[PDB]
Amino acid sequence: PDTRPAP
């Protein structure tokens, strides 16, 4: 949710 999404 708060984590930066993967490329």
């Epitope: 708060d2 984590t3 930066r4 999404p5 993967a6 490329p7």
Partner: antibody, heavy 116, light 113 residues
Framework: EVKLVESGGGLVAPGGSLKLSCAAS????????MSWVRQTPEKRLEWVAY????????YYPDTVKGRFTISRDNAKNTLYLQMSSLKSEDTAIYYC?????????WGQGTTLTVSS | DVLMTQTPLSLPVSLGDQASISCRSS???????????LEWYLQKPGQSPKLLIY???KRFSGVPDRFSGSGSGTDFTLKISRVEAEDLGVYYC?????????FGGGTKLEIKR
């Protein structure tokens, strides 16, 4: 405690190759994706590589794509960055990063100098 | 690529006073999922960068309450509400919505004494 310790830096001729290492400890290494960020002598920050927790989805900016290769050994708790066809513009301090919310934890860095 | 441009380049400020650091992107930075991944990093002299704020306004653990982030569209802002001497260093903004991920150029915070 979470400690990240980079190694392998030094001086390399233009066009040469060099592989960096990073020793991870203080957390479950296999659960977190990792990144490399570099800082140039102009103190500009550049993201250079990403890899997910399981070793997949290796991603790069086009400035190092085809030349740099990120990899990891979850048994040894180590992150790697193979470099090749090195240019002057690659000279920098290279930081190993445990990534989750953003770049959460940075190593102290190891220095690559590309010069004849 | 997304260009991140910071304002001012240097910022003198007295202890206990407020500091504001602006970030301007060359384009909107909303991920496919609707969220904005703008991050603030502080590099103190002789140290690695450290995360202060992610997702525009969420403080990373350990970051005191006086650090506050805001913004939308192309304009984002970091506020330090009661500067302490330990706050000096170079502040970088960063966008993690579009690839390649990009940093701003940095703003040096200088303490007046």
């Amino acid at each position: 405690e979470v400690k990240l310790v980079e190694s392998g830096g030094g001086l390399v001729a233009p066009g040469g190759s060099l592989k960096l290492s990073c020793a991870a400890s203080g957390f479950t290494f296999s659960s977190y994706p990792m990144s490399w960020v570099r800082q140039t002598p102009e103190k500009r920050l550049e993201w250079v590589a990403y890899i997910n927790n399981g070793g997949g989805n290796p991603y790069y900016p086009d400035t190092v794509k085809g030349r740099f290769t990120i990899s990891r050994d979850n048994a040894k708790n180590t992150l790697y960055l193979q470099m090749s066809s090195l240019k002057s513009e690659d000279t920098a301090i290279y930081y190993c990063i445990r990534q989750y919310y953003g770049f959460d934890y940075w190593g102290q860095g190891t220095t690559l100098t590309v010069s004849s | 690529d997304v260009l991140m441009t910071q304002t001012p380049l240097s910022l003198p400020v007295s202890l206990g006073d407020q500091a504001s650091i602006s970030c301007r992107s060359s384009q909107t930075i909303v991920h496919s999922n609707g969220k904005i991944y703008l991050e603030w990093y502080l590099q103190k002299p002789g140290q690695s960068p450290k995360l202060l704020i992610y997702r525009v306004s969420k403080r990373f653990s350990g970051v005191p309450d006086r650090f506050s982030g805001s913004g939308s569209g192309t304009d984002f802002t970091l506020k330090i509400s009661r500067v302490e001497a330990e706050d000096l260093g170079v502040y970088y903004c960063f966008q993690g919505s579009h690839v390649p991920w990009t940093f701003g150029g940095g703003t040096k915070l200088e303490i007046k004494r």
